[PDB]
Write a protein that binds this DNA or RNA. Structure first.
Ligand SMILES: [Mg+2]
Lengths: 207, 255, 226, 51, 51, 221, 40, 216, 49, 279
RNA sequence: AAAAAA
């Protein structure tokens, strides 16, 4: 590789109570940033979300804004690049309802979400509600108008995102798990949403 | 790319209580398709599907031999869309989605591809989308389904590697189906047209295996403009809609 | 000879007023005069002669350009490859007109002089001198052949009349010629064999660069085609 | 404004007051400290200078 | 002829030859290149003002 | 430290040069002032496009460092405000490593500097002053300072160095140090002892360079 | 690009990591389950 | 105001219309959305409802102009070049019939300015074009652009028309508009100050360059 | 000012509980002023001949 | 859902092919599809030999829409720059629409923007074959109050009037380019050709506030029959549409017309009816 | 995305 330093190509790699921590506005490189850390049982997750925008696009005739989300692997190389694109597509399907696009014509908002540390003692399903929490904080910190606070929860691999105080749904992610958990997951994630919502609102007011 | 005058017309027409589709279809009607099978001798299985809008998808089924103890995934689905990159956002999304739809521990029996206690058949599924005027996730799904129904592999000889030089094995399995739904106002829609998805408030991707709803189940945004939140009753309605009209489409594609 | 190097001290005393020129640079802050090129300093007037294959737009310079584009406001003419374009106005032609525009296609050779040439602005040329009877050979150059040479060989050929090129070529053949200061030389004859004979001479003379070797090369070149 | 009913303004206000009281007024969850799990200690560090 | 463009030229030539003159009053309301008139605009004083 | 150099070996380029030192041979070429790309345009100053390719393989991050270090030297040399909104393409191709290219890149760096400056002269670009670069190394055992070493002298060397100085007034007075690179274990005393021998040897190559230009430029005029 | 190379070159030239410090001292695993022992 | 003072994104502020009883007559308060607010639709009791909802975290301000305007003020984006505003720009390139620049900051209203943060090495920064006829009111026909502006010089101007979605159209016709900050020799020399309206001098090297200067 | 966090992202962060999934041999988090730096060290094995 | 599973597989008119000599007579005038080489005329495309008067040409079996002066076409705005509009009429090139070729009442994006459909007339032609659009008429303008559908350009022949009124209170705009627009019959549509023998709302983006379901399903059904006639490669005329719309009334639900066996039924019905009462 | 007659 003439772009980076990959080293010797003839070598081989190595072969062998909910708690939240929220911090926003700690990056001066962008317009809005957020830090989300969650520790539960034997599984903790720490990720960082950066928001760059809204910045004008030359020649753009779009009467509304354009959101782009990309997930990255900060340290541990676990999640496939194909799967990262899938979640990104899912995340954009959420905030396109959340973000007031009519406010930013001829403009675009780029969202970078760095997945730093994730310990585990499906798989990426559990990180999804934390990514939504991070982005919604980073957007609100950046100054981007949001119609409502976006939040979600993970119950038996079934992720569902809520707005308008859980009355409606802005995203639904079902992978593996089992059946007939429709009513249960909707009630369990709604509790996680309300919990994540109040902590998100408190996070923006305090600092 | 429709004008606002068209979008405002189609929305008011679809969001109405007696929802009128632009083509007259009922919320459960499917557009007429055409499926060709077994047209590739070099491959173990093949399929081709033509849609109403002119959408086309070619799916090829090939296989090899490898240890199933060193390989957890015996089913690899690759998607190549014409005029699109291999690292494109939509391409890698569908590539990742179909792999979850067809997986050894999701919607596909792993014992079916089991020959011996040591070696087993690994199936390579290739997808070539010639034309796409909408979300091909449902179109490709019907193509992979018909491709796995008509498949021929080298026939085994011993038990628990050698193969039969002439006679072949026909893989009989129940491949999963993926039905994309459109959420417009308070009404649910099956098989969204090109122009319908551009005004739809939201959308649903629902899978189907063994006469029952199964994972993956996603909520995709069919557009980037008129995307709005939806009530939970629409998800229960949509799922039930797929549930009752699935034995009809399965029965049709069976012949 | 007195050879000069960039950064060296300037021999000329700052007491007596001396007009500037190409080759020397006036520092916008320290106000000191220093050489920026390598060559021979000529003091009559103060300038430095240095070897350069690349031409730069300058006032009152005869150049041979090629039309690379035709706009509504002016012409886009390239005096040299990869260099920035030059603006040739429609009114820069003799017997100009308002509605009616001069007839020039893309690729036509034009012999014009540079009127206004700013460092930070697009240069401009005019197909009529300001002025020398309006006819110094200015205008469209029909047919013929052009040759790329260094700027040193071009200026000495046009200005200095002691240069044994037009003198030695006139004896071998009768022809009309136009020389630009951008390293372009346009020569047209009657028979094609004569034009080819002239091209091969200048090509060899520019390479060897010898004043007394002009007659020797011209003798063997014209006898080679026969 | 004279087209729309005036007492309806009192109606949509009462339906607005009963909307807020039955929505944002109800929220209860056990208080959780914002103590750092991993990077929360060092990332939002206040800028200090040394001489 | 050698460029096969003769059919087009004779076509455009006939359309030139069939050009009909008509007074400004009895001119067609739709502007065309097949009918000529001194004034082709209903309000010719409009373009005079904006100039 | 006997070297060899030629001027104007390339035809279709505005200016070129071919530098030879020991075994490392780096040929350079310069085209400008020419039309710049939209992304390279500088409203006031002059844009510099520097390209350095190795003798074997394709240009990697190693050569990206060589381009970055070479840029630091040629930048203050050229009077950028003489050519507003313009481009200068400087390409340095290494013909032979003349050393161990995997471990040391400081020999080729000095040669890329020398060849580039000569090309700048040939192309006829506005230069504020002159320049000269020499490779220096310090052996672990002998602990002596060697100016312009060889390949075998680098393998047993403790620390490698690179010096490039700017010269004014007949190539005698030093205006400022343009580039000073050092790699390996060395103290402060060895540093000031490096410039003591370096500045002496630099001026030796400056006056050596000056006479090369005279022999090539003068016959053209 | 430059930083990645500058970090690699400086570490290499500052003599921080010897090639002997990267030598892998292997071991064996025999069945008694499986017990692993290393030479000391 | 009987309405919540502090508002997070998604918090209900006030309904569509409002009214009160005073002086024996009904006064109608008309609530209209503003910067930070968004009129959306909610459902309750099987009946639709429209109410003003804040979209940005901050304090709610209810003001009236010679109707009640509901807006939310954060603790930049809203600021955008509009016809009549004064804008500080920097010359990117000079042509013969015009002079294009890039927008850096915009003057506020009662000095204070609003700095637009963008990358100047990309082109994401707003670009603007100053016509040759918009240089000065004196002799609008013939104007030498070389003797007016210069690459790198800072120019204070006022935007006339936005035109298309690419370039803004400015002007320096009035006295308080023109080249503000500039240096000798395209920035190579020392700093220069504005004396005469058509002359800029440098009280350091004694250099004088012809520019279009504003009034101190 | 310089404040760091070493061995926080490594698998050898905790003596008792060792991460079976994490392949990081050594790590460091650094923040000098506004700029933050996160370093992770991984490894590999190659046959030398 | 309908499927089709097939396994194992995937005064005369002269037919000519590229390279074939059509005639050895240099007298004829060279037209389209033919190139001249040494007094011989060769065909450049594959199709039928068209001999009309002095003009000799070859008609291709299939080709994009060729714009002619006076053609009533329906187009979509592709891009807007300077003082012009470039409209897509489904031709080889984008038709152009000058600012002086529209109606200004008493920032061009406030009138027409990317995505907007419109009907216009080909005012003139450029040398490259591009068409110059002209919307200055009471019959032309920005399109609304309906739905768009596309049929092959070779299925709609030129006519004196391309805007027809149909039973069901809807109106069709049969463009020569194949682009068709169905809409609710307005005041202009009702009385247009009749009063002849007897303005800021024209660029509005909003449709008619009151669209009855009787018209929506009419617009819907009229669209299904047109694309059905196109499915059978039948030339669409105002009579073919009305007949198909009436012949499709035997099907209660409108959605049943989307089927292949149903479309070919309506198509064959008109072909046999016009053949029976035509002779 | 200027052009032709007088
Ligand atoms: Mg592809």
């Amino acid at each position: 590789d003439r772009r980076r330093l990959l080293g010797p190509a003839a070598a081989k790699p190595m072969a062998f109570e909910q708690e939240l921590s929220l911090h926003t506005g700690f990056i001066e490189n962008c317009n809005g940033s957020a830090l989300v850390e969650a520790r539960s049982l034997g599984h903790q997750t720490s990720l960082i979300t950066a928001v760059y925008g809204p910045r004008s696009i030359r020649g753009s005739f779009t009467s509304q804004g354009t959101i782009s989300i990309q997930l990255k692997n900060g340290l541990l190389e676990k999640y496939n690049t194909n799967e990262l694109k899938e979640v990104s597509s899912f995340l954009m399907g959420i905030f396109n309802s959340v973000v007031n696009l009519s406010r930013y014509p001829k403009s675009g908002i780029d969202i970078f979400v760095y997945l730093t540390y994730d310990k585990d003692l499906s798989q990426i399903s559990s990180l999804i509600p934390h990514c939504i929490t991070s982005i919604t904080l980073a957007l609100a910190d950046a100054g981007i108008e949001l119609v409502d606070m976006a939040g979600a929860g993970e119950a038996n691999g079934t992720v569902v995102s809520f707005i308008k105080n859980g009355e409606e749904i802005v995203g639904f992610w079902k992978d593996d798990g089992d059946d007939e958990d429709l009513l249960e997951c909707l009630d369990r994630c709604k509790e996680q949403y309300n919990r994540y919502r109040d902590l998100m609102i408190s996070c923006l007011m305090n600092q | 790319s429709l004008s606002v005058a068209e979008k405002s017309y189609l929305y008011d027409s679809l969001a109405s209580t007696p929802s009128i589709r632009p083509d007259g279809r009922l919320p459960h009607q499917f557009r007429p398709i055409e499926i060709f099978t077994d047209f590739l001798p070099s491959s173990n299985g093949s399929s081709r599907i033509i849609a109403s809008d002119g959408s086309e998808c070619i799916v090829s089924i090939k296989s090899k031999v490898v240890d199933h103890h060193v390989e957890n995934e015996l089913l690899q689905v690759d998607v190549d869309i014409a005029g699109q990159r291999d690292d494109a956002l939509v391409v890698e999304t569908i590539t990742s989605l179909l792999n979850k739809v067809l997986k050894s521990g999701s919607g596909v029996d792993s014992s079916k591809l089991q020959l011996t206690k040591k070696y087993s058949f690994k199936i390579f599924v290739d997808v070539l989308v010639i034309s796409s005027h909408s979300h091909p996730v449902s179109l490709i799904s019907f193509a992979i389904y018909s491709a796995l129904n008509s498949t021929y592999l080298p026939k085994l000889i011993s038990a628990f590697p050698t193969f039969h030089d002439y006679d072949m094995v026909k893989l009989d399995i129940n491949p999963p189906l993926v039905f994309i739904l459109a959420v417009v106002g308070n009404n649910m829609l099956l098989d969204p047209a090109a122009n319908e998805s551009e005004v739809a408030n939201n959308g649903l991707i629902i899978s189907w295996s063994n006469g029952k709803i199964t994972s993956p189940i996603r909520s995709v945004a069919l557009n980037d403009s008129n995307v709005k939140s939806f009530k939970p009753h629409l998800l229960k309605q949509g799922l039930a809609m797929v549930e009752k009209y699935a034995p009809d489409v399965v029965r049709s594609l069976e012949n | 000879s007195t050879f000069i190097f960039p950064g060296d001290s300037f021999p000329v005393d700052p007491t007596t007023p001396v007009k500037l020129g190409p080759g020397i640079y006036c520092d916008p802050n320290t106000q000191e005069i220093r050489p920026v090129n390598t060559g021979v300093l000529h003091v009559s007037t103060a300038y430095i002669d240095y070897s350069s294959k690349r031409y730069i737009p300058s006032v009152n310079d005869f150049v041979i350009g090629v039309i690379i584009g035709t706009f509504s406001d002016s012409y886009k003419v390239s005096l040299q490859n990869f260099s920035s374009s030059v603006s040739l106005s429609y009114m820069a032609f003799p017997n100009a007109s308002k509605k009616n525009r001069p007839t020039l296609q893309v690729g036509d050779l034009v012999y014009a002089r540079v009127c206004t040439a700013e460092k930070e602005l697009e240069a401009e040329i005019e197909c009529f001198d300001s002025t020398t009877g309006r006819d110094a050979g200015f205008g469209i150059l029909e047919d013929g052949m052009i040759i790329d040479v260094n700027l040193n060989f071009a200026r000495q050929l046009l200005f200095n009349n002691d240069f044994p090129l037009l003198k030695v070529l006139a004896a071998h053949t009768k022809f009309e010629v136009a020389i630009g200061l951008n390293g372009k030389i346009w020569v047209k004859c009657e028979e094609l064999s004569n034009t080819l004979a002239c091209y091969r001479t200048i090509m060899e003379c520019c390479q060897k660069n010898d004043t007394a070797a002009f007659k020797d090369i011209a003798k063997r070149q014209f006898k080679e085609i026969l | 404004l004279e087209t729309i009913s005036v007492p309806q303004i009192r109606d949509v206000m009462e339906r607005f007051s009963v909307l807020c009281n039955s929505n944002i007024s109800k929220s209860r969850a056990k208080p959780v400290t914002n103590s750092s799990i991993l990077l929360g200690k060092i990332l939002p560090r206040e800028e200090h200078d040394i001489a | 002829i050698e460029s096969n463009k003769l059919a087009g030229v004779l076509y455009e030539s006939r359309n030139v030859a069939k050009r009909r003159f008509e007074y400004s009053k009895y001119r067609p309301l739709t502007p065309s290149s097949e009918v000529y008139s001194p004034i082709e605009k209903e309000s010719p004083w409009k373009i005079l003002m904006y100039q | 430290m006997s070297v060899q150099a030629e001027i104007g070996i390339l035809d279709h380029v505005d200016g070129s040069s071919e530098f030879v030192s020991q075994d490392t041979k780096v040929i350079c070429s310069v085209t400008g002032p020419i039309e710049p790309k939209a992304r390279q345009e500088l409203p006031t100053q002059l844009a510099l496009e520097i390209i350095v390719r190795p003798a074997k393989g394709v240009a990697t991050t190693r050569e990206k460092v060589l381009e970055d270090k070479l840029r630091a030297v040629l930048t203050p040399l050229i009077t950028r405000h003489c050519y507003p909104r313009q481009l200068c393409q400087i390409t340095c191709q290494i013909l032979e490593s003349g050393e161990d290219e995997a471990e040391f890149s400081l020999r080729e760096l000095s040669c890329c500097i020398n060849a580039a400056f000569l090309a700048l002269v040939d192309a006829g670009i506005a230069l504020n002053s002159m320049c000269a670069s020499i490779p220096i190394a310090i052996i672990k055992d002998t602990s002596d300072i060697i100016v312009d070493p060889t390949a075998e002298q680098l393998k047993i060397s403790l620390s490698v160095h690179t010096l490039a100085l700017e010269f004014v007034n007949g190539g005698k007075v030093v205006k400022n140090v343009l580039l000073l690179d050092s790699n390996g274990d060395f103290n402060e005393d060895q540093l000031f002892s490096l410039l003591e021998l370096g500045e002496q040897k630099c001026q030796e190559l400056v006056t050596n360079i000056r006479r090369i230009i005279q022999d090539n430029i003068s016959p053209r005029l | 690009m430059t930083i990645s190379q500058k970090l690699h070159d400086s570490i290499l030239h500052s003599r921080i990591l010897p090639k002997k410090a990267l030598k892998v001292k292997a071991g064996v695993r025999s069945a008694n389950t499986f017990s692993v022992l290393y030479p000391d | 105001f009987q309405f919540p003072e502090i508002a997070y994104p998604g918090k209900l502020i006030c309904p569509q219309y409002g009214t009160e009883n005073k002086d024996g007559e009904d006064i109608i308060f008309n609530y209209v959305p503003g910067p930070g607010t968004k009129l959306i639709q909610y459902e309750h009791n099987g009946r639709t409802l429209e109410a003003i909802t804040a979209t940005l975290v901050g304090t709610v301000r209810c003001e009236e102009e010679k109707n009640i305007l509901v807006s939310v003020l954060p603790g930049f984006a809203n600021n955008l070049p509009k016809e009549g505003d004064i804008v500080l720009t920097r010359v990117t390139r000079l042509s013969l019939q015009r002079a294009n620049v890039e927008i850096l900051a915009v003057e506020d209203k009662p000095a204070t300015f609003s700095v637009s943060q963008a990358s100047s090495d990309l082109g994401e920064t707003f670009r603007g074009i100053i016509r040759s006829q918009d240089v000065r009111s004196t002799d609008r026909d013939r104007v030498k652009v070389i003797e007016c502006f210069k690459p790198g010089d800072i120019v204070r101007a006022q935007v006339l028309s936005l035109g298309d979605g690419t370039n803004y159209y400015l002007t320096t016709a009035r006295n308080d508009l023109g080249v503000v900050f500039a240096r000798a020799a395209n920035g190579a020399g020392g700093l220069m100050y504005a004396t005469d309206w058509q002359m800029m001098t440098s009280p350091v090297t004694g250099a004088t360059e012809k520019r279009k200067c504003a009034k101190p | 000012d310089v404040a760091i966090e070493n061995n926080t992202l490594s698998r050898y962060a905790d003596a008792g509980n060792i991460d079976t999934k994490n392949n990081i041999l050594g790590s460091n988090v650094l923040k000098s002023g506004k700029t933050i730096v996160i370093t992770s060290i991984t490894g590999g094995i190659i046959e030398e001949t | 859902i309908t499927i089709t599973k097939r396994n194992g597989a995937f005064s005369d008119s002269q037919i000519v092919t590229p390279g074939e000599l059509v005639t050895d007579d240099p007298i004829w005038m060279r037209g389209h599809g033919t190139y001249f080489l040494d007094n011989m005329t060769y065909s450049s495309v594959a199709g039928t030999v068209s001999r009309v008067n002095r003009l000799l040409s070859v008609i291709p079996l299939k080709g994009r829409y060729a714009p002619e002066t006076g053609d009533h076409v329906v187009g979509r705005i592709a891009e807007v720059g300077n003082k012009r509009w470039k409209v897509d009429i489904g031709g080889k090139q984008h038709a152009v629409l000058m600012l002086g070729s529209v109606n200004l009442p008493g920032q061009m994006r406030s009138f027409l923007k990317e995505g907007d459909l419109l009907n216009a007339e080909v005012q003139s032609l450029f040398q490259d074959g591009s068409a110059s659009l002209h919307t200055r008429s009471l019959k032309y303008g920005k399109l609304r109050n309906g739905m768009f559908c596309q049929v092959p350009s070779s299925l709609i022949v030129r006519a004196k009037n391309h805007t027809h009124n149909l039973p069901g209170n809807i109106t069709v705009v049969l463009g020569v380019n194949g682009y068709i627009w169905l809409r609710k019959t307005s005041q202009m549509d009702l009385a247009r050709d009749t009063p002849s023998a007897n303005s800021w709302q024209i660029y509005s983006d909003e449709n008619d506030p009151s669209i009855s379901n009787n018209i929506r399903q009419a617009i819907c059904r009229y669209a299904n029959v047109i694309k059905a006639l196109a499915f059978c490669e039948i030339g669409i005329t105002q009579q073919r549409i009305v007949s198909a719309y009436e012949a499709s009334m035997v099907y209660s639900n409108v959605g049943e017309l989307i089927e292949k066996n149903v479309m070919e039924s309506i198509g064959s019905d008109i072909l046999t009816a016009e053949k029976m009462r035509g002779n």
